């Protein structure tokens, strides 16, 4: 179960970091910023909570945004490396929490498709803490594959 969830985490991290490397093969700033933000996210989450951290990522983005629902976010539409990277990280983390690695997979999320930032404001402290553990787990995988695949 830990085995299968670790397998799904690795698969997802590979997918999302590969996409960054593919879309920004010749933009090392985007690669580097995404790597940095993935690495620093765990500390922000521990000291502020997952909800605040997701809101933090959104706070960075050029406004206005149509919809901060993670499915609606187009990371590639922002106009600097920092914004693009924060949008990606928000979108990736949110997607993991709400959908896991897909309906097909051994883990399909914790929020049942509810926007995670919203779910976090509604559920028990213990359920928020469980989602926080899961966020930290996927972030660790993302960090490892960023160090394997992306420029710093």
UniProtKB/Swiss-Prot annotation:
Localization annotation: Cytoplasm
Single GO cellular component term: cytoplasm
Biological process annotations from GO: defense response to virus
Annotated keywords: Antiviral defense, Cytoplasm
InterPro entries according to UniProt: AF1862-like_dom_sf, CRISPR-assoc_prot_Cmr5
Family (UniProt): Belongs to the CRISPR system Cmr5 family.
Protein name, UniProt field: CRISPR system Cmr subunit Cmr5
Native species: Archaeoglobus fulgidus (strain ATCC 49558 / DSM 4304 / JCM 9628 / NBRC 100126 / VC-16)
């Amino acid at each position: 179960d830990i085995r299968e969830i670790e397998q799904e985490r690795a698969s997802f991290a590979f997918k999302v970091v590969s996409d960054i490397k593919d879309k920004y093969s010749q933009n090392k700033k985007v690669q580097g910023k995404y790597s940095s933000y993935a690495e620093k996210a765990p500390t922000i989450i521990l000291n502020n909570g997952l909800g605040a951290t997701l809101a933090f990522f959104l706070s960075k983005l050029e406004k206005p945004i149509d919809d901060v629902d993670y499915k609606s976010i187009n990371p590639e539409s922002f106009g600097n490396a920092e914004n693009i990277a924060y949008a990606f990280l928000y979108k990736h983390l949110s997607t993991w929490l709400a959908e896991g690695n897909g309906k097909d997979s051994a883990f399909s999320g914790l929020t049942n498709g509810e926007d995670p930032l919203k779910y976090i404001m509604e559920k028990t402290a213990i359920d928020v803490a469980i989602s926080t553990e899961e966020a930290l787990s996927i972030l660790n995988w993302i960090k490892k594959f960023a160090k394997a695949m992306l420029e710093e």
